[PDB]
DNA sequence: CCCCTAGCTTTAGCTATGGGGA
DNA sequence: CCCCTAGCTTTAGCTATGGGGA
């Protein structure tokens, strides 16, 4: 959920909207490849354990909302959905390969989304421990036991 | 600037919330300490091509807005402003080295900041090439050169 | 900005805070 | 969640989508 927890003391919250279009800017993201596209995309996301909170496309774009663990990076994401899904597409559609050099470019679009923590910044640093008394640990532990974690 | 573009060809605006606090949660983020701080996480910044937009501590902790390559990596720029600046810090101020084990803990709190891109991803859209024709070049060149980086 | 090579998956087709440069 | 080990910088003191587990 909207906020998570590293395997260790991590806590987190990165939502990116991630943006490329085909070669040339063209047109195949329909029908067929349109829908094969989102499900290869779906299964690098669950594999890399990217949460794809949204997700669509339109004709000569895809665009992707996801959370992303900070240590493992964004750009990581995106070199396996891409690289993936163009092996794939261009083998089950062969009109991707004859007409396109490749599926994608070399470039592609990201940026940041969320508001001003504020509170939830507040309640960071008023659960951190003070001290090693049995208080303080229970009282972090409740903290971050009660975070959203991303297994798989 | 709001939106940058990769040394290649990502255009990106990423934006991160950083904040990590002493050990124990120790007020110790004031005077000396908290000026020196300030100046070292500012030299590891420009160091790591990291745009501090804003900063600030405040007793027991150190507040960052800052813009990452986010073919960089975020960890990247905490690893080092809470690696060197414990090591210098507890180097210049022994107070810090005597009374505590290290001058952080292995946590951290991180959280994108930034809202939806709407106009901002059509024009990245409508500017892509959609053939090697000059006009096509011309607009594409036009647009990314017309976009902030960050060299150094 | 381009193209070239490394690096690694998808072993094709993508990224590398990559690199060098009429 | 903890602690251990390795990796890399700050060669101390931090992170690793790290690992294993009364």
């Given at each position: 959920a909207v906020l998570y927890k590293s395997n260790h003391n991590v806590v987190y919250?990165?939502?990116?909207?991630?943006?490329?279009?085909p070669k040339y800017r063209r047109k195949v993201l329909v029908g067929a490849v349109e829908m094969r596209l989102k499900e290869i995309i779906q299964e690098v996301a669950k594999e890399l354990r990217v949460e794809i909170i949204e997700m669509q496309t339109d004709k000569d774009h895809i665009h992707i909302l996801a959370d992303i663990d900070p240590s493992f990076g964004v750009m990581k994401?995106?070199?396996?959905?891409?690289?993936?899904?163009?092996?794939?597409?261009?083998?089950?559609?062969?009109?991707?390969?004859?007409?396109?050099p490749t599926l994608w470019t070399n470039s592609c679009f990201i940026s940041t989304v969320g508001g001003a923590p504020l509170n939830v910044v507040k309640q960071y640093i008023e659960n951190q421990q003070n001290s090693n008394r049995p208080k303080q640990k229970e009282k972090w532990k409740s903290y971050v036991d009660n975070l959203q974690t991303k297994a798989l």
């Open positions: 919250s990165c939502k990116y909207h991630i943006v490329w279009c994401f995106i070199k396996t959905a891409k690289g993936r899904s163009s092996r794939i597409l261009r083998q089950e559609f062969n009109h991707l390969k004859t007409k396109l």
